[PDB]
Design an enzyme around this catalytic site. Structure first.
Site: not given
Ligand SMILES: [Cl-]
Ligand SMILES: [Cl-]
Length: 162
Positions: A11, A20, A104, A117, A132
């Site tokens: 991040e 972002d 997150f 998954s 996947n």
């Protein structure tokens, strides 16, 4: 390597309001402020969140404070989630970090959407799950970060981050 260091790598850290990858107003270590197009709405949310008039800028400490809350919230959300909890309980410690990373970034509901998954991780079919997971918008939009997370699930080690 730990969850905090892993997310700090994924991040980054910025002390001023930025956009972002999706164009939303964010601050610190991946802390989404608002999906609103308004810089002002961002600034108000930011002040609400810190408890002070920040005028779009925060300190390192403040950023780390928000980061501690967000990682706690992510972990507690997984544990309350009826679809996420069983997967998390079934995983080893490294893989657990990988699921915290997805949550997150994408929110609890978004990860819970990866039905197949999830089933494959719980069954420990590492290679199948990796294949996947990659068939997603998530992977197409932030491929480098997705590959890193995916490798973590596949191998069970911190290699991708080292
Ligand atoms: Cl796809
Ligand atoms: Cl990326």
């Amino acid at each position: 390597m730990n969850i905090f260091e892993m997310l700090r790598i994924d991040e980054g850290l910025r002390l001023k309001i930025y956009k972002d990858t999706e164009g939303y107003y964010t601050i610190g270590i991946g802390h989404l402020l608002t999906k609103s197009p308004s810089l002002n709405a961002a600034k108000s949310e930011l002040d609400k969140a810190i408890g002070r008039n920040c005028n779009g800028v925060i300190t390192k400490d403040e950023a780390e404070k928000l980061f501690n809350q967000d990682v706690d919230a992510a972990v507690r959300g997984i544990l309350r989630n009826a679809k996420l909890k069983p997967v998390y309980d079934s995983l080893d410690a490294v893989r657990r970090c990988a699921l915290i990373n997805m949550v997150f970034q994408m929110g609890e509901t978004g990860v819970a959407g990866f039905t197949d998954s999830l089933r494959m991780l719980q069954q420990k079919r590492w290679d199948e799950a990796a294949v996947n997971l990659a068939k997603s918008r998530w992977y197409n939009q932030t491929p480098n970060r997705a590959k890193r997370v995916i490798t973590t699930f596949r191998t069970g080690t911190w290699d991708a981050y080292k």
